[PDB]
Amino acid sequence: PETLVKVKDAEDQLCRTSHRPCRVGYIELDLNSGKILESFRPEERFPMMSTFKVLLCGAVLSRIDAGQEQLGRRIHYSQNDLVKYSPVTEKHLTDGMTVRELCSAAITMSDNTAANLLLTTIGGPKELTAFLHNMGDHVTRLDRWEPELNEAIPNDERDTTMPVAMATTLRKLLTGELLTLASRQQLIDWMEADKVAGPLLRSALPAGWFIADKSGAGRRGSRGIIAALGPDGKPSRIVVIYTTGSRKKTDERNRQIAEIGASLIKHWG
Ligand SMILES: [Zn+2]
């Protein structure tokens, strides 16, 4: 209960002053078994924001496994493709970027143009959704491209997941035979190399722990993170935290997620 008491306090704190739909969602799964250890609002919808980028790179790796795509395949793209927050892609207009490099940028740096270019490779948000459905996630859906997918219109289901659907999908991507081991290894390595989630779970993580994660931020207070983490330098659980609707500032939203993290670490067992 203690971490769930903390998630509820977090929600109470982030949503008291919201005067619009506002919630926090949380699940913790055992990575090996898939067992749900604890959850809060497990089947309610939250905007994915940049956490979709892990799923996207999943779809891409699936195509690589099927010999329909190559990690080394180079994409030269246009300035017209560049959208807000493109820290890596805007540096490679001349030389282009490989698929591998685009996934690295989309995951480790949350580069939006990298994500859109990867979406184009698979046929767009509806095709990502078709991929998800095909691997047993009949909940998660991507509908728009970057940046519009972050609109977070209260109770709009476009571009959303559920905590339990995301957690299970992440588990299947990282540990299933859905992907080849080579592909699963690369996916988790991109997540481990995440450079832009410092103020969330990583801020509560003891040294020596493993964490592979992907954060997201969007409109209307939306913020979240998906992670595989564990003590002694290997992952053993999946954690998914989302929130939407809060009017509190970024730093308070980050702090609340970090505190949920500090609690689940404290009560890890
Ligand atoms: Zn379906």
Swiss-Prot record:
The active site is at S50, E148. It comes from the Bacteria. Its EC number is 3.5.2.6. Keywords: Antibiotic resistance, Disulfide bond, Hydrolase, Plasmid, Signal, Transposable element. One of its GO terms (biological process) is beta-lactam antibiotic catabolic process. Pfam families: Beta-lactamase2 (PF13354). Substrate binds at K214, S215, G216. It catalyses: a beta-lactam + H2O = a substituted beta-amino acid. The beta-lactamase present on pBR322 was cloned from plasmid R1 (R7268). Belongs to the class-A beta-lactamase family. TEM-type are the most prevalent beta-lactamases in enterobacteria; they hydrolyze the beta-lactam bond in susceptible beta-lactam antibiotics, thus conferring resistance to penicillins and cephalosporins. TEM-3 and TEM-4 are capable of hydrolyzing cefotaxime and ceftazidime. TEM-5 is capable of hydrolyzing ceftazidime. TEM-6 is capable of hydrolyzing ceftazidime and aztreonam. TEM-8/CAZ-2, TEM-16/CAZ-7 and TEM-24/CAZ-6 are markedly active against ceftazidime. IRT-4 shows resistance to beta-lactamase inhibitors. This is Beta-lactamase TEM. It comes from Escherichia coli. The lineage of its organism: Bacteria, Pseudomonadati, Pseudomonadota, Gammaproteobacteria, Enterobacterales. The gene is bla.
